[PDB]
Ligand binder design. Sequence first.
Ligand code: CL
Ligand code: CL
Ligand code: CS
Ligand code: CS
Length: 106
Amino acid sequence: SEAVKKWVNKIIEENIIAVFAKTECPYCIKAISILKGYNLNSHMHVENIEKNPDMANIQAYLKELTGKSSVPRIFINKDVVGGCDDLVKENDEGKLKERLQKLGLV
Ligand SMILES: [Cl-]
Ligand SMILES: [Cl-]
Ligand SMILES: [Cs+]
Ligand SMILES: [Cs+]
C-alpha cells in the first residue's frame, strides 16, 4: 500500500518530532512526556495508530523504517530515535539535548 506509506511519510516529514503511539500505552505516555518536558509540543505530532483501520500496515512500515513494529516509534527530523528506552538512553547520555540544540529547539 503506497497510500499507507505516503501517509506515514507525511507525518514524519511535516513534523520535526513524530511519535507513533497507541491507546493506553505507558511507554508511549512516558516518551511523549519526556519530549514535552523539552517544550517541544509546537514541533511535535503524536499519531495514535491503534485507532486506525490500517494499524498492521502502519506497524509493518514502521518496522521497515526502524527495525521494530512496536509503539512508541520516535523520529526526530526524520532520523530514527527508536522506542522509549532508546529515548531514555539518549536523554540520560546527553544525546537528546544535543539533537534538539542542533535543530534550534532548545
Ligand atoms: Cl528501534
Ligand atoms: Cl526498541
Ligand atoms: Cs528536560
Ligand atoms: Cs502538537
